[PDB]
Design a protein around this ligand. Structure first.
Ligand SMILES: Nc1ncnc2c1ncn2[C@@H]1O[C@H](COP(=O)(O)OP(=O)(O)O)[C@@H](O)[C@H]1O
Ligand SMILES: [Mg+2]
Ligand SMILES: [Mg+2]
Ligand SMILES: [Mg+2]
Lengths: 312, 50, 312, 312, 312, 309, 313, 48
DNA sequence: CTTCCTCGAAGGTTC
DNA sequence: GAACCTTCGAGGAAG
């Protein structure tokens, strides 16, 4: 596998990585389970990978499930009974599971026991069942989407963030070794600049540049070759994809920068409005290419100069 | 008496009467409590994996 | 456990405690339930805890649920049939319970009867139920968001305010005494001042600084260790959260201080309107960082002298 | 009990009582059922209470249901099939019924028949159900939601008015007897003037004062115990809350009596736009403290003497 | 009885009554079924009554059902297929039928056939069902709610208008002979002029005065008894209720006639915005007491001379 | 009968009628089936009538069903199995078919074969050359992939006074009534451009002529018969004339809102907007504006008032 | 040709065609299957035809299925056994597959083996089935509803585009050889310009012009006949129908460009709300003739200069 | 062979087939001696 | 998936 | 230019 297995191997995320070390070793000194941890941030930064490292650093058997995989209380109650003292339970998309399940999870995290009420009318009873000590690790794409009373149960908050050019250049070179790719230290920087901060993207671009270098070249990835290959893949120097370039070009040429409504824009470019607002707008907003107003979207000055058009 | 309780608990958790019957009926231990029965009917029905 | 058990253990909220003492004591001479009590105010101020104290003072059981968790009118009827005489039912976020469910409380609270349809098809018939005497305790963030018919049935209303430094300082000293730890009086004051006037935050931070002082320090908390440990976390030198920084750092740069509508601001920072207006805005206003205007919120001079900008 | 059961015990509403007495006496002489009657008016004035009194005067069993309990035509047909000659059917909150079910009453209310579909589906035909004589009693807080063809079928309309101080004083005395608490006539008038003319509010204050008068009073609601207790609840001598008092003060201290706009004033008091207009302003205008004008609203002389400022 | 049965007993509606006489007589000379008739207009003007008259004059049996009873195509295919040559089918509240059902009538009305899928599985087949000649009659208050292809198929359209003082006077005398009461001609006109032009309202006032005349009088209605009873009901000589007078007075004594907005007036009378606009405002405008303008409501000279003020 | 049988009997629709004649003649010359046709437009113009003419002009046997009656895939498969070479399948109100059925039909229209799983089992069938004809008033409700498979589109238009005048004369002879040339034109003017409405007035006038007359329609009988029905010489009904009058005499021509105007005539808000206004706007008697609606100069001239801007 | 066998025979799509050529050649230089490929684009552009050409270029057999036709895991697993080493599996409408099958595809794509867990508790076991390497080719019109785990398995993305006049013209010319009719190059261009960039729409106009050319002419489609044929049909030199022209004229002549609401516009042209919003409005937006605003539709300057009316800000 | 039959039939049921139809599907195979892998492979291949 | 209804913007008058 | 009133248009959520 490509993913790291110990903190001394995990590149980047120095803040999150440094905080967890203190809390993990402190918990060992006390001989007790780690507090419930919530991981959040953009997709593809390494949230799932970190979960395995925590279990290895603790020295515990990891157990995994996901939000959509739990459909009834019996599923969660069963999994919780199959736990062993100190086990770490990782739940992807902890915000996606059905609300009827959350009612049971709140008891477990807080009391470490569940109490199933049974009977009606003249009959009314409850069975009190103890649970072993454990730690819940959840991962989500947004922190505000999760149920507010649940969020208060997570003691440790880990905010992931985009990697920097020094980290991405190291990851690109490391991957090139696994594939036995000859890459110069300058070409590695070219892909890192255009991978827009996400390791998943940097790895996918490299796999595509390899094929080009084996045909349009001598199998040696030079900076001169890497730059030609990226123009063939239609990737901008800032990393804007074909769809991102289509959005900006349309706003400037057909609407003079706006304001323009989402419905109009999403009908001009043949794309579903649900995709534009979810997969593409967030990067354009964070990087400051687009602004949102009550009248519609607007192209900033930075965008006007980047595409190469004279501003008004 | 624990049979009616265990079966009723598993029904409350969302198991249908058919499976709740089979689950509790598959386990048998005259000295087991309704608590240890519930902790057995589920542990006996979950697919452990490695 | 951390949670207080009796009014003599509950610190602060003297105005509310003083009133509830009289009514609870009077409700003990006569053999009757306490009137339906509504608690409202900012989150984390200790209103769920108050419910447990009232229940322990009356000597009855406490059942708990939340508005959003109730899906249909048949759900609430099933709960009310399972309450013993004098039990207390606590409903969090009662202002968000669906209208189809709220319609049922009007009769249950005033006369202790409910009309419902039972059976199906040829068997369908109307039955008139009797509810054993019970007390409803509601919690809401927005005192004015409840409907006029529901608000008129609550016989007692309690407004819960932020805690003062003498109160928070003692809460930190109490919490650092349940855990085996030693904290100097000056460190307790600094940690309280940094805790947004909220007990939940003060507990969460203290629990984390316990780890740092046990690994990176001498096993004792001092101002020098508190200032360092609070700097490894994102807590600002005057308690502002990292989200608070984005808000101020955006209004001053993207809007020149405002005015700006909180609706458009929320979507530009990628935060849910409801969370920012309920949790963050109230503190920033009551501390003079943001001022209200008809056109929207405006960043005050106090923000410029804090973020290091020029108040041009 | 608290709710009166006969017209001799029912204080006030003389205009409604006078009409109903003549119609009930005339109906008995002919040995016929009473015409359908509709009760409407503001909350808490005694509508639901009157519906039961009518049943005791007619001397028949009262069947009971509610607008939100009926979900589909099958329910309404089942309820009507259980009727007996002369039965009274009370439907509280009738404005909540769905339109498709409300239109079933159009025949039942004047032709006494219903069209139903019966049979397995191979053979199925329409048939007339025939109903025994019955009287429908409806009560609603807002009659404008009832369709025009429904309101036209009700034969007797009762509009509830607010209570005056002479009549509201007698309600407080009657309730003190049921609680077995002695109250001086001087004090009964002090609670009546603060009850906003509503019986429900007068009962709520009397219960709160009753508790205080026995936990630290001497068991008698004298002229001085009432003032000490009502000062703790923070109810002004005109029934103004802290919010109501704040409004009048701000207009006089910061605007010289106005005119001031709704948006301008709301910001100066940190109050939500619609809350000020729906929750608070209505009572202030009705009592004459505030006056609406084409250029804004103005505080009258009455609002000056109540606050002690010098009117000019 | 209370409903007329022949055009001799049907007072008024000269336009609609004259047209139906010619169409019925012509249909008899050719010995063929009457064309499809749609009856619509305000509530209480004689729509359902006319449906039974047409059936008697044609000399055929009438089959009756209602829109809320027909829920699926299987029901309509069951009512049809039970018709005999020359039958009349009367559907009341035809606007409630689902549109997925209305499209089945398109073929039945124009060509007297329907396409039926018969059998199931491999036996499923399409076959024509052929209907005998028949006349569909429909009555509705919301004609604009029907589909354009359906309204286009109704061959006769009857719009009902309000009655006048001569016709309403005779109606009151006729009804006064179904019950056994003597009524002076002068008293009959006094009740007619107060019945807003609607036969249902005239009958209701007569029933109410009957009760008073037999309880508070000698059992006969004369100008003395009528004027006393009409004072208890508090209905003026123009049919203005108690709240109708309060609205007009407020406009003339506080705003000098206006203009005034709906909201500003509602609060001054303690009514609610939906009751005033839907229950009281409609008749005041239709009779010329109030005029609606871009700036608000204004009282006309006709209102000044009714309340007795000076039209300055 | 009332429904024409051939193009030689179908008056008007010169655009749609001319186009179909070219496509039908070409298909016959090649001995091929006619392409799939979609007929749509306002009510009463002739959509269902034209569907039968196409079958007679082609000389084929017409199979007929409707959208509301077809409720599951098993129903459609049974019908399709009965088609022979050249047959025509006509589906009226095609906009009501379930979505689970539209996906099956647009496959059959492309490749003439079906393979669908209907206790579940697969059934495969091959279809001969056939023509599908659909008629609908809500063409925009059909799925976008289905509209792409239709090869001929016919949009219907309203008729002119010469077309309606000849229709009235044709219908009058089926009822064996006598009518004059100038009396027919007085009914055409009032028929709002629709054949169904012109046929309705003729039936209502015939009833009056038989009872209140000699059973013959003439320039004098029509004057009296149309006064009883109260239909203006522009086709305005009683409520149509009352709306324009109220606007010109109480609001000085507007602007006024839909709510205010409705309360003043004692009509429901949805009846005015959905039943009376559509004709007044298309004839140019009323205009909608951001602040309300106003009566145009054409209304002043018709009602007989001195116009003032 | 209309029925192509190699990338040399495929008209248009030069961008996606040039990329896949480099990837296939590199995959051939190793004993490896081509990476899983995902094709994006609007409906009707040729995604099915391209999948076939990919297989022939690879020299491999092609299997076809669809998302809706797959209802249980056993359906998909049975098809995978039919794949020979290197075979291509094409799944249409892959975004509609039920999650119960989606969770099974991950291991087949990532590891080329499937695990079938069976038993419970002390009887828990799993069987293992080896699968020959294969390339999954997916096509979907909607990407915003694919899950992130599925998205991460696809490594090659392709975006389809509307055809352009210099190549859509060749499709018309070629189609005229399936029928037996002569068409002049200038006439072919006038048909391509009005076909909205979709091959399916260009075939429909050709059939209609053919019928006219052999009943009203000499059985030859020259520029003189094409003008008459396109004059009988309403289609303008921009592809606008008669009703499309009526909408723009109405907005410009009666409302001064708007804003105007959907309901007010519908009653002027005598059509249903859903008909204008779903049939005619979508193309007018793509062409840039109208915008949608919180206050209603508004006409742009591009529409004024096309209808031929003077314009003012 | 009952071990492989029960295992292979059970795995075939785990793929969503009904117990009745799943039992017939494997019962329809001739060779009993071949391992569960062969039974499921042959069963699904024949059922294609 | 469909009917309803409410949140929001902007045209016009008045001091 | 601040404050009120009316009218239209597109969402969205409870059936
Ligand atoms: N006065 C107090 N003294 C001690 N601990 C408190 C006090 N108020 C709150 N807490 C603690 O802080 C947390 C408050 O949570 P909770 O009462 O649920 O707040 P909310 O109800 O607003 O969510 C609990 O952990 C509780 O023990
Ligand atoms: Mg009540
Ligand atoms: Mg009726
Ligand atoms: Mg038709």
């Amino acid at each position: 596998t490509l993913r790291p297995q110990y903190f001394k191997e995990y590149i980047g995320q120095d803040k999150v990585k440094d905080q967890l070390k203190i809390f993990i070793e402190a918990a060992k000194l006390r001989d007790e389970a780690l507090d419930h941890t919530l991981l959040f941030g953009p997709p593809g930064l390494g949230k799932t990978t970190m979960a395995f490292v925590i279990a290895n650093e603790m020295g515990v058997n990891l157990k995994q499930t996901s939000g959509p995989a739990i459909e009834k209380a019996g599923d969660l109650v069963a999994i919780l009974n199959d736990l062993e003292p100190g086990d770490i339970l990782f739940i992807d998309e902890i915000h996606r599971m059905p609300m009827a399940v959350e009612e049971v999870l709140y008891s477990a995290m807080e009391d470490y026991y569940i109490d199933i009420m049974i009977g009606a009318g003249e009959t009314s009873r409850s069975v009190h069942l103890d649970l072993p000590p454990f730690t819940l690790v959840g991962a989500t794409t947004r922190a505000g989407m999760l149920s507010n009373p649940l969020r208060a149960r997570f003691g440790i908050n880990g905010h992931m963030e985009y990697y920097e050019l020094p980290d991405l250049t190291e990851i690109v070179e490391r991957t090139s070794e696994i594939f036995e790719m000859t890459i110069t230290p300058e070409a590695a920087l070219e892909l890192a600049r255009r991978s827009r901060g996400t390791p998943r993207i940097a790895n996918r671009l490299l796999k595509r540049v390899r094929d080009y270098a084996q045909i349009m070249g001598d199998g040696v990835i030079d900076d001169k070759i890497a730059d030609q290959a990226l123009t063939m893949l239609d990737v901008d120097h800032e990393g804007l994809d074909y769809v991102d370039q289509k959005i900006l070009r349309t706003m400037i040429e057909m609407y003079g920068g706006g304001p323009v409504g989402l419905g109009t824009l999403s009908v001009n470019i043949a794309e579903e409005r649900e995709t534009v607002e979810d997969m593409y707008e967030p990067y354009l907003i964070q990087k400051g290419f687009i602004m949102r107003t009550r009248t519609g979207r607007v192209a900033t000055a930075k965008a006007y100069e980047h595409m190469g058009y004279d501003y008004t | 008496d624990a049979e009616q309780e265990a079966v009723a608990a598993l029904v409350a958790l969302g198991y249908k009467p058919q499976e709740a019957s089979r689950m509790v009926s598959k386990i048998a231990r005259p000295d087991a409590s309704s608590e240890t029965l519930i902790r057995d009917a589920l542990r006996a029905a979950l697919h452990h994996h490695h």
